[model samples]
Target: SKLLMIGTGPVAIQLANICYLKSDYEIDMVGRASTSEKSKRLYQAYKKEKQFEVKIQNEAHQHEGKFEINRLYKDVKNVKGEYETVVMACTADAYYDTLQQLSLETLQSVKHVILISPTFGSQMIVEQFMSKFSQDIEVISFSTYLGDTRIVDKEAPNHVLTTGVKKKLYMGSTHSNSTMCQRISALAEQLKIQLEVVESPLHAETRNSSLYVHPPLFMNDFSLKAIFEGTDVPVYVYKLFPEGPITMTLIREMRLMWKEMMAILQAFRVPSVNLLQFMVKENYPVRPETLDEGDIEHFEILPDILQEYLLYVRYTAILIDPFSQPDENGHYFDFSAVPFKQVYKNEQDVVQIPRMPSEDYYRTAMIQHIGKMLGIKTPMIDQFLTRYEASCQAYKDMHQDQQLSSQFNTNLFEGDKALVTKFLEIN
Candidate 1:
């Protein structure tokens, strides 16, 4: 089987390395960072050595190893042979734009799209895009990235590191049945990947555990002020947030967000997963040392979502390196250390604030829309949206020609009863 791996991120390299080791498939890669110096340097390295290296660090299980990637490619258009699968190991925000860049010929030759980092409604978005070409590409959605990885060097492939690998990952298909699911599961096993397929792609997409915690982390006033004011924020995300009163306020709202998400899952009739268990199992970094003496014992008995909040408070009390280094005044640092850098930017050497808020708005708006569709009242979501929008407008007032982009808006189900009906179908 031939595979085309898109994006030039750490996971893209990690996947390429793993697939190469499997030896059952031929792999080629193309990245949107064609003009980036880092991408060009990587391209040159691949051209010269025909392979890169990967180092795995499984912190949870205390396992570590290194591997190599021998895949070769210059561009998607110039790549030879039809690919059985095209793995989209890119950001969720870039999914549609990435597909748009591909030629219809390239898309038509592909059998499947393995979307590694999908947000809510991801499968439907891909399905709509593929509809343009009248293509029947089977879209497989993963709840999150396969693992936590980082590129240690800008110019070397020998330094890619896989910090943490999930024991199991959730996957579901946009338009697939049992046989196709079985085939996909078998293929994943062949590549030494642990994949658990669900009923529908929406199930996997909505189960995006990050959405539960990240919105509050980014959409809060303190984090936003840190970005717009150009002030240094807390370095560690969860640890210090617990010590402050503002974070408690943030967590209260975060609990509400989680409930809204739970409402969505309920509407779909998906099995209810305790939010805290999902967080600790998938996204949070709660090691033995990170916990207190009786913390684990007490934690085991707490209720679902409250345990999630307790973990935040517990970790926040501990000041660690990178973000928690104490100053001369005996004060620890607090930062907005979350995955939302792309939401803000220094565009044209000017601080653009309006664009920063829209990305956060996208998630909140989607949740709110779903709540409305299901007749679930999300007052917390509504309150957050209003405040967030007001903040965006305030930021806009500070700058000239600043406005939100409709590109990230949710218009998929707008006035489209059929689409809405399809979305409501869980199975």
Candidate 2:
């Protein structure tokens, strides 16, 4: 079967090699200019030494003399024919020329659309395909770093080794269980990839990065920047990391995550393994009390470690933050009561949530809210607001170029209560 790799990134390349390792799937790396020299080298290396027929060319909208990659990259309106499947391995943040590339021809011919990226962006792609093409094309999504596996093919970097070992891959389709799992299993079997089928993309979100990116990246960093700047490493790494988690008071965050994920699972009626049991198996953190064999029986409530931390929490953090809007009138201002009204009688009355112009415009509002709740006066609120704004700006600036690739050892709720509290108090 002809397999058109919708992306030429690490995941796509890994799957291509896996397909060659297991079956005879024709692989085409379709995209714009190679992301980097390393990526281009990967394509050339696969061609020179690999088993499968891999074409490292841009997907053209129309067939012309000698497939012009630049033209196809510019606009994918001319792409022709269909294939057995199209593997999506593009980065979530990347613009894969998705609209231009998924032309009618590609959509019609493509039998199965496989996503190897995380859930957030893949949902958008699936939505686009479902809306544009009326064909009975099977859409499946999974997160397996086949390309990262390939990185070990030549030389293993410390970063790669840390992330690649003992990670269980997860996948699922839109409405029901399709032959999608069977096909995914077939590919995994041939490529030696391990996969677990999930209920839906939302499940994948909670199970993946959503939970993991919250405390350290968002909460921890926010507190620190207002006090004293630390090392150059990202707060995400510092907080939930091997050492950081051990130090930070993230036990609360852990309880918070487990509670939230468990809530969702129970709400959806999805049975689960206990958090400790899941963590012990994945080599994730499990407190001593949780390690008792007697407790293992009830530990079925836990999901995979990656899903529990990264997918679940990170998803909730990012998804909620973006959608949250300020309440306008005193009638709808309940959240404000949690921190605003009782504490800062002076400032709380001044800041009107609904009248705010935009989301960014509310930084001062949040500072005032926090200060008011903490019983800090206007001078302190002003001081902290300046620091908070600076930290927020730094986060925004760094995030634009942040490449979040690692899924292993990337827990968001590392136990850093003292550190967080210290930072927050001092800041």
Q: Please tell me which predicted candidate would have the highest lDDT against the true structure.
A: 1
* Alpha-carbon local distance difference test for all models: 0.62, 0.41
Instruction: Report the lDDT of model 1 for residue 42.
Output: 73
Residue-level lDDT of model 1, residues 1-427, one tens digit each, is 6788887667887777666654466777886335555566777776666656677654433223344443545554455556667788876656666666677676667767778887776676666666555557688888878767887776675357887666678888866664556776876676466787888787887666667666676667665655555445443344444332236577767777777777777877776555555554554445456555454445545665655667555446443332355799876554433433333433224444343455456556666766777889988778767766666566666755644434323343343233334555532
Error of 2 at 172 (Å): 2.3
TM-score of each: 0.72, 0.52
Q: Please count the clashing residue pairs in each candidate, in the order shown.
A: 6, 40
Encode model 2's per-residue lDDT on 1-427: one tens digit a residue. 6776656444454455555555466555565434344444444544444322222223321111111111112123434566677666665323234534566666666566666654333443453434346456566765434323333443211011112433466776664567656766675554444677787653553344323323322233333342223334433322334323212234444444445445434544555435444544442443344244554544444444433343233322322122345456423212111111110111212211121111112222332333343454444324433544455455445554433221111221122222223324543
TM-score, prediction 2: 0.52
Q: In model 2, where is the ten-residue run with the lowest total lDDT? A: 336-345
Output the number of the TM-score-best candidate: 1
How far does residue 88 in candidate 2 sit from its true spot (Å)? 1.2
Which residue pairs collide, candidate 1?
Answer: 233-334, 233-335, 234-334, 234-335, 235-335, 239-316
